[PDB]
Scaffold this active site. Structure first.
Site, PDB file in Angstrom:
ATOM      1  N   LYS A 181       0.855  -1.152   0.000  1.00  0.00           N
ATOM      2  CA  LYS A 181       0.000   0.000   0.000  1.00  0.00           C
ATOM      3  C   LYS A 181       0.889   1.198   0.000  1.00  0.00           C
ATOM      4  O   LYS A 181       1.958   1.188   0.670  1.00  0.00           O
ATOM      5  CB  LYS A 181      -0.882  -0.048   1.270  1.00  0.00           C
ATOM      6  CG  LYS A 181      -2.069   0.899   1.278  1.00  0.00           C
ATOM      7  CD  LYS A 181      -2.911   0.677   2.509  1.00  0.00           C
ATOM      8  CE  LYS A 181      -3.828   1.849   2.794  1.00  0.00           C
ATOM      9  NZ  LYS A 181      -4.824   1.375   3.829  1.00  0.00           N
ATOM     10  N   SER A 220      -9.299   1.622   2.516  1.00  0.00           N
ATOM     11  CA  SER A 220      -8.332   2.301   1.709  1.00  0.00           C
ATOM     12  C   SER A 220      -7.220   1.459   1.090  1.00  0.00           C
ATOM     13  O   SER A 220      -6.503   1.960   0.295  1.00  0.00           O
ATOM     14  CB  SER A 220      -7.725   3.460   2.511  1.00  0.00           C
ATOM     15  OG  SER A 220      -7.189   3.053   3.749  1.00  0.00           O
ATOM     16  N   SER A 221      -7.102   0.186   1.397  1.00  0.00           N
ATOM     17  CA  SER A 221      -6.101  -0.672   0.750  1.00  0.00           C
ATOM     18  C   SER A 221      -6.666  -1.261  -0.558  1.00  0.00           C
ATOM     19  O   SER A 221      -6.565  -2.474  -0.837  1.00  0.00           O
ATOM     20  CB  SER A 221      -5.698  -1.821   1.684  1.00  0.00           C
ATOM     21  OG  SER A 221      -5.508  -1.328   3.005  1.00  0.00           O
ATOM     22  N   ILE A 225      -8.176   1.139   9.834  1.00  0.00           N
ATOM     23  CA  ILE A 225      -8.615   1.832  11.021  1.00  0.00           C
ATOM     24  C   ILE A 225     -10.151   1.811  11.232  1.00  0.00           C
ATOM     25  O   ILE A 225     -10.626   2.041  12.358  1.00  0.00           O
ATOM     26  CB  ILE A 225      -8.043   3.269  11.080  1.00  0.00           C
ATOM     27  CG1 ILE A 225      -8.040   3.774  12.545  1.00  0.00           C
ATOM     28  CG2 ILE A 225      -8.817   4.232  10.188  1.00  0.00           C
ATOM     29  CD1 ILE A 225      -7.135   4.994  12.787  1.00  0.00           C
ATOM     30  N   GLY A 226     -10.893   1.504  10.162  1.00  0.00           N
ATOM     31  CA  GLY A 226     -12.358   1.363  10.108  1.00  0.00           C
ATOM     32  C   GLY A 226     -12.760   0.212   9.186  1.00  0.00           C
ATOM     33  O   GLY A 226     -13.979   0.012   8.899  1.00  0.00           O
ATOM     34  N   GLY A 227     -11.755  -0.582   8.771  1.00  0.00           N
ATOM     35  CA  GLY A 227     -11.981  -1.693   7.854  1.00  0.00           C
ATOM     36  C   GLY A 227     -11.105  -1.827   6.624  1.00  0.00           C
ATOM     37  O   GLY A 227     -11.362  -2.677   5.742  1.00  0.00           O
ATOM     38  N   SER A 228     -10.095  -0.999   6.519  1.00  0.00           N
ATOM     39  CA  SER A 228      -9.384  -0.774   5.264  1.00  0.00           C
ATOM     40  C   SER A 228      -8.557  -1.934   4.727  1.00  0.00           C
ATOM     41  O   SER A 228      -8.019  -1.833   3.643  1.00  0.00           O
ATOM     42  CB  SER A 228      -8.504   0.461   5.405  1.00  0.00           C
ATOM     43  OG  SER A 228      -9.299   1.654   5.360  1.00  0.00           O
TER      44      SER A 228
HETATM   45  C1  LIG Z   1      -3.692   9.394   7.682  1.00  0.00           C
HETATM   46  C2  LIG Z   1      -4.520   8.130   7.580  1.00  0.00           C
HETATM   47  C3  LIG Z   1      -5.885   8.178   7.294  1.00  0.00           C
HETATM   48  C4  LIG Z   1      -6.521   6.958   7.184  1.00  0.00           C
HETATM   49  C5  LIG Z   1      -5.817   5.745   7.403  1.00  0.00           C
HETATM   50  C6  LIG Z   1      -6.545   4.491   7.278  1.00  0.00           C
HETATM   51  C7  LIG Z   1      -5.962   3.249   7.482  1.00  0.00           C
HETATM   52  N1  LIG Z   1      -6.943   2.341   7.273  1.00  0.00           N
HETATM   53  C8  LIG Z   1      -8.061   3.058   6.919  1.00  0.00           C
HETATM   54  C9  LIG Z   1      -9.404   2.452   6.590  1.00  0.00           C
HETATM   55  O1  LIG Z   1      -9.697   1.563   7.690  1.00  0.00           O
HETATM   56  C10 LIG Z   1     -10.481   3.558   6.483  1.00  0.00           C
HETATM   57  C11 LIG Z   1     -11.880   2.859   6.440  1.00  0.00           C
HETATM   58  C12 LIG Z   1     -12.987   3.939   6.275  1.00  0.00           C
HETATM   59  C13 LIG Z   1     -13.232   4.522   7.648  1.00  0.00           C
HETATM   60  C14 LIG Z   1     -14.220   5.680   7.514  1.00  0.00           C
HETATM   61  C15 LIG Z   1     -14.849   5.665   8.895  1.00  0.00           C
HETATM   62  C16 LIG Z   1     -15.566   6.837   9.264  1.00  0.00           C
HETATM   63  C17 LIG Z   1     -15.952   6.935  10.628  1.00  0.00           C
HETATM   64  C18 LIG Z   1     -16.657   8.044  11.085  1.00  0.00           C
HETATM   65  C19 LIG Z   1     -17.032   9.073  10.212  1.00  0.00           C
HETATM   66  C20 LIG Z   1     -16.698   8.958   8.848  1.00  0.00           C
HETATM   67  C21 LIG Z   1     -15.979   7.843   8.376  1.00  0.00           C
HETATM   68  O2  LIG Z   1      -7.861   4.401   6.915  1.00  0.00           O
HETATM   69  N2  LIG Z   1      -4.489   5.697   7.716  1.00  0.00           N
HETATM   70  C22 LIG Z   1      -3.864   6.888   7.793  1.00  0.00           C
END
Ligand SMILES: *Cc1ccc(-c2cnc([C@@](*)(O)CCCCCCc3ccccc3)o2)nc1
Ligand SMILES: *Cc1ccc(-c2cnc([C@@](*)(O)CCCCCCc3ccccc3)o2)nc1
Ligand SMILES: [Cl-]
Lengths: 544, 545
Positions: free
Chosen positions: B110, B185-186, B206-209
Site C-alpha cells: 500500500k 483504503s487498501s 482503522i475502520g476496515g481498510s
Molecule cells: C492518515 C490516515 C488516514 C486513514 C488511514 C486508514 C488506514 N486504514 C483506513 C481504513 O480503515 C479507512 C476505512 C474507512 C473509515 C471511515 C470511517 C468513518 C468513521 C466516522 C465518520 C466517517 C468515516 O484508513 N491511515 C492513515
C-alpha cells in the site's frame, strides 16, 4: 465543613486497630500451639528457599504464614505500614493450589490492589466505606499460584507522591530511621518488606513509586513496561490518561524474588483473565544469560544533582561491572528536561489537574503533598502569568507550572505524538551506541519526612522511564558513610531553586541508610533488566 | 489558487506512466531471454508452493519476479491499482537473504508503506515530491526475510475512505466489474492481488481498510491487534490519535499466505527494529490446532441491514461450521450504536477534524470522499444545531455529526476511559459464553464507485473491531446470485436515512461478485483467528487447501 473527612478517618482508624488486634490474636494462638518453631530461621530464608521448603513439605503454610504475620505485626509498631489485615486469608491458606509457583508465600499488597470486601481508600475519604466487590486480576493470579495475600500497606494520600502519609491511616516511617520517609507511593510495602515482615509484595509506579521506596528502604523493586502486567481491577483516581501509563511490579529483598514473581504472574491465568495484556511468557533463558553486557551509564542526569552517596554508588557499580568483563559506555538520554517538564508533566496533567482534584473535594490535604494541590487549583491564566514571572529566575519551576495547564484534545494529540517520537528518539540513541542495558543513579538516601512533596524535581531519575515506558528496577548496593554525609554540606544543585534547597537539607543526616542504582532495558525486556539487576546484586552484595 | 494541486497531479501522472513503462520494458526483455518458462503455471501456484520451489531452487527469483511483474502490469490496465514501480527492486532480487522465509516473493505494498526514494502521497498534493528517506520497519523486515517489495498500490485520497480514488493517480476499479469500487483504503492491493498479479501484500486498517477491499475483491485479509506489528515509518495524516488505533496486516489469496506473512514478520528483526512492539512470536501450534471451536455468531448487527448475499453467506458458513462439529452460539457485542456513534467517531475526530483537514489545504477533494470534508469544516456550533434539528428524523446522522465536534483533553480522557471499559465489557460477554472466536457478516458485495463516501453507516461491521482492537479478518465464501441481487429491491435498512438509501442502490447490480464473512478472536490471538479463517476457507472453498 469537614464532617465526612473526620468520620472517614475515625472509621478507618478503627478498622486498622481491629485488623492489627485480629493479627495479634491469631499469631499468639499460633505461637502457643507451636512453641518449638525456630521463627528467626524461617524469616531470614531467602524467598527461593522458603518456596522450595514449602513445596517439599518441610515447612507447613500455617508455620510460614503465622510467623510472617507476627513479624509484620511487630515491625508495624515502629513503621505504621499496615492499613488492613486481609481477614479471609487463613481460609486461602488451606485452599492454596499445591503446585502453584508461590504455594504458601505470604504476599503484601499496596492498598490499591483491590481485595474482595476491603476498601482501597488511597488515603482519601471519598473512597472510605466503599469496599471492593472482587479481587483484582493480579490478586487472583497470585491466589491461583498458591500465594497468600495477607495485608494492605499504606500509601500517601491519592498515591501521587514519593512520601507515604495520609489523613486516614497517617504517616508511614522508614524502618532504618524514623525521621526518614520510606518512599512512595508504595511506601508501606517498602517499610514492611525492608524490615523483614513480608518476603514479596506488589506495588505500582507512574513517576518512581516502586523504585523510591525500594531504594529508600533498602530492597529490590522492578517497574515493568506498563502493559506487561494487568492493571485490571486496580483502584485509581484519574481515568483515561494514556500518555504516561501506570505500571505494576514486585518488591522483595532480592532480584531472584522479583523474577519469581514475574514468572508466576506471566502465566495462562493472567493472559486469559486480561486478554488486553500481551501473552509474553517469562523467558528463563534471557534472565539466566551470563553473556557480557554493553552497559550505558551516566553519573548525573544534569537535572537533579546527585548526593555524594548516589554518585559513589553509581561509580563503584560501574567499576565492578567493568572488572566482571562488561563494557561500560557513557550515555545520557537526550532532552531530559523536556521529557520531564513538557511530556511527563503535560501528560499527567493534560486537563490541568481537574480530574485528579475531584478526589480531594471535601477532604483534608496531608502536608506530605506540600503545595501540589494548592498549585493545581490555580486558574490556567494565573499558572501562565506566574510561569512568565518566574521564568528568568527559576525556569524549572516555570516549566512545571506552565505544562500543568488544561488544553484541548488537539494539543493532547500533539503531546501524545511527541511522547511517541521522544520514545523512538531515545531508542535510536540506544541502538546507535549498541547498548544492551542502561545503569543510572537512583535517588537516595531517603529524604526527611514531608520533604518529597517539596522536592518534585528529584523525580527526574525515575520519571524519565515512565515517560519512555522502559522497564526500570533498583538494587541496593551500598550504605551512606560519614564521609558521604559530611559531603552534603558542599551540595548546591544545578538550579539553586527551592527544590534544590529542600533536597540538600532533606538528604542530610543519613549515615547508615541504603542507597541504590537503577537498571533499565528496552520495552518488553523485563527479563534482561532483571538479568542485569541480578548481576549488579552479585557484584556489590555477594553475601546474601 | 489550485496551481500546486494541478502541478502535483501532473508530476504524479508522469511518474506513474514512466514506472509502468519501465516495468513493461523489463518484462519484455526478460521474456525473450527466457522463452521456455511456463508463466501461467507459475502465476497460479499457491504462495506456499511458490515459496517452497523458490527455496529448493526449482524456480529462480528472476523468473518469479518478472513473471509477477508482467502480470501486475497487465491487470493494472483494467484496474489502475499501481502508482509506482519500486525501481530499486531488481538489485534487491540478487541481494535477497537465501534462508529467508519469503526468499524471492514479490510483495505489493500500500502506498503509505514508506519506501526509500518514493513518495507516499496518500493522494494528497501536500506529499507529492517528498520522497521517503528510508524504508519503514515492516519493509525492512520483508527485505531481511528475502521478499522483494515491487510496487506501490493506490489509495483513496488521505486513506480515510473505503473507496479508492484520488486526484493524483485517479480511480482504482474492481477487477470483477469496472463499475464497482475495489474497496479501500487498501484498494490498490485488493485489486492487484485479486486479479492475480501479486501473491502477497500489506495494507492498513482503522475502520476496515484491509477487510473492505479484501471482501470486495474476493481475497483474504487480516487486521491484527493494533500493536502486533510495527507502524514505525508508515506515512500518516493525523498524529497522536491513540483511542482508535491503526493496524497493519497482510492480504493474499489464501489464509495460509496470511499466516506465512505474519510468521515471517514476527521475528527478531522486527522486534529489535521496533522495541515498542511486544515480541510475541507466531504460535504455529495454535494456528494448526484442529480442536473444535466455540463460535459466536450474529447475522446482522442491527445497524447496517445486510444484503441478502451477506446474510446467505453468513448462514451458510454457520451451517457448515456446525456440520464440521463446531458449536455455534448467538452473540452480539453490547451497545454497538454507542461504540460507533460515540466511541469510534469521537476518538477518530476528538479534535473536530482540524488535524485531518490540514492535509487538504489547497488540494482538490476527490468526489469519492463525498461531503466528508465539507461536513468536517463546519463550525462546532453549526454541527450541534444541525444535530439537534435532525435528531428526531434521522438520529444516526445526528449522532455522527454531534460526536465530530472538538473537545478538551479532559473529555478525551473520559472518552478514552469509556473505550477501555467498553473493551472490557465485550471481553466479559465473550468469556461468559466461553467463546473461542466470533463469526460476523462482512460488508458486501462491492458498492458502486463513489458510493462508499455516502454510505458511512455501513462501516458498522468492521469499525466495531477497530474500536475494540480485536483481530479481525475476512475470507471470501460465495458469490452473488441473481436471486440475491433481485432481493435487493426488498432492502429498506433499519433507519431509512440517506445512508440506507445510498447503500441499497449501491449494492445493486452485483451478480457474480464475491462476498465474505468476518472472523474475530480476542486481542493478541491472531493465530487463533487465522485458524478459524483457515477453517472457514476449507469448508466453503475446499480447493484453496
Ligand atoms: C492518515 C490516515 C488516514 C486513514 C488511514 C486508514 C488506514 N486504514 C483506513 C481504513 O480503515 C479507512 C476505512 C474507512 C473509515 C471511515 C470511517 C468513518 C468513521 C466516522 C465518520 C466517517 C468515516 O484508513 N491511515 C492513515
Ligand atoms: C490515582 C493514582 C495516583 C498516583 C498513582 C501512582 C502510582 N505510582 C505512583 C508513583 O510513581 C508516584 C511518584 C510521584 C510522582 C510525582 C511526579 C510529579 C510530576 C509533576 C508534578 C508533580 C509531581 O503514583 N497511581 C494512581
Ligand atoms: Cl501493547
Amino acid at each position: 465543613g469537614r464532617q465526612k473527612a473526620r468520620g472517614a478517618a475515625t472509621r478507618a482508624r478503627q478498622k486498622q486497630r481491629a485488623s492489627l488486634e485480629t493479627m495479634d490474636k491469631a499469631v499468639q494462638r499460633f505461637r502457643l500451639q507451636n512453641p518449638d518453631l525456630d521463627s528467626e530461621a524461617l524469616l531470614t530464608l531467602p524467598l527461593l528457599q522458603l518456596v522450595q521448603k514449602l513445596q517439599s513439605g518441610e515447612l507447613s503454610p500455617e508455620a510460614v504464614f503465622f510467623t510472617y504475620l507476627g513479624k509484620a505485626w511487630e515491625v508495624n509498631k515502629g513503621t505504621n505500614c499496615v492499613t488492613s489485615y486481609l481477614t479471609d486469608c487463613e481460609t486461602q491458606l488451606s485452599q492454596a493450589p499445591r503446585q502453584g509457583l508461590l504455594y504458601g508465600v505470604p504476599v503484601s499488597l499496596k492498598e490499591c490492589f483491590s481485595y474482595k470486601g476491603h476498601d482501597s481508600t488511597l488515603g482519601l475519604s471519598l473512597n472510605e466505606g466503599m469496599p471492593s466487590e472482587s479481587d483484582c486480576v493480579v490478586v487472583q493470579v497470585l491466589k491461583l499460584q498458591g500465594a497468600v495475600p495477607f495485608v494492605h500497606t499504606n500509601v500517601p494520600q491519592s498515591m501521587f507522591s514519593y512520601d507515604c502519609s495520609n489523613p486516614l491511616f497517617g504517616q508511614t516511617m522508614n524502618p532504618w530511621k524514623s525521621s526518614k520517609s520510606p518512599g512512595g507511593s508504595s511506601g508501606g510495602e517498602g517499610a514492611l518488606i525492608g524490615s523483614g515482615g513480608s518476603p514479596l509484595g506488589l506495588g505500582t509506579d507512574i513517576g518512581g513509586s516502586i523504585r523510591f521506596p525500594s531504594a529508600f528502604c533498602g530492597i529490590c523493586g522492578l517497574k515493568p513496561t506498563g502493559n506487561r502486567l494487568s492493571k485490571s481491577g486496580l483502584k485509581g483516581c484519574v481515568y483515561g490518561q494514556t500518555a504516561v501509563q501506570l505500571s505494576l511490579g514486585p518488591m522483595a529483598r532480592d532480584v531472584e524474588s522479583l523474577a519469581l514473581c514475574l514468572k508466576a504472574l506471566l502465566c495462562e491465568h493472567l493472559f486469559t483473565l486480561d486478554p488486553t495484556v500481551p501473552p509474553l511468557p517469562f523467558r528463563e533463558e534471557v534472565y539466566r544469560s551470563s553473556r557480557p553486557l554493553r552497559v550505558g551509564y551516566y553519573e548525573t542526569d544534569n537535572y537533579t544533582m546527585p548526593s555524594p552517596a548516589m554518585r559513589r554508588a553509581l561509580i563503584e557499580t560501574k567499576q565492578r561491572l567493568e572488572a566482571a568483563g562488561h563494557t561500560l559506555i557513557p550515555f545520557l538520554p537526550n532532552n531530559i528536561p523536556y521529557a520531564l517538564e513538557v511530556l511527563s508533566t503535560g501528560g499527567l496533567f493534560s486537563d490541568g489537574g481537574r480530574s485528579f482534584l475531584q478526589n480531594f473535594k471535601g477532604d483534608f490535604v496531608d502536608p506530605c503533598l506540600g503545595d501540589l494541590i494548592l498549585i493545581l487549583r490555580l486558574p490556567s491564566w494565573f499558572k501562565r502569568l506566574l510561569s512568565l514571572l518566574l521564568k528568568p529566575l527559576f525556569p524549572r519551576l516555570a516549566a512545571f507550572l506552565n505544562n500543568m495547564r488544561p488544553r484541548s484534545a488537539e494539543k493532547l494529540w500533539k503531546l501524545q505524538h511527541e511522547i511517541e517520537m521522544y520514545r523512538q528518539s531515545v531508542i535510536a540513541q540506544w541502538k546507535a551506541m549498541n547498548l544492551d542495558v542502561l545503569l543510572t543513579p537512583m535517588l537516595g538516601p531517603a529524604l526527611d519526612l514531608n520533604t518529597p512533596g517539596r522536592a518534585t524535581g528529584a523525580v527526574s531519575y525515575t520519571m524519565l522511564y515512565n515517560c519512555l515506558d522502559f522497564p526500570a528496577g533498583v538494587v541496593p548496593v551500598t550504605t551512606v558513610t560519614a564521609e558521604d554525609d559530611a559531603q552534603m554540606e558542599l551540595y548546591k544543585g544545578y538550579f539553586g531553586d527551592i527544590w534544590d534547597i529542600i533536597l540538600k537539607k532533606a538528604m542530610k543526616n543519613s549515615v547508615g541508610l541504603p542507597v541504590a542504582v537503577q537498571c533499565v532495558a528496552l520495552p518488553w525486556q523485563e527479563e534482561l533488566c532483571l538479568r542485569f539487576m541480578r548481576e549488579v546484586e552479585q557484584l556489590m552484595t555477594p553475601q546474601k
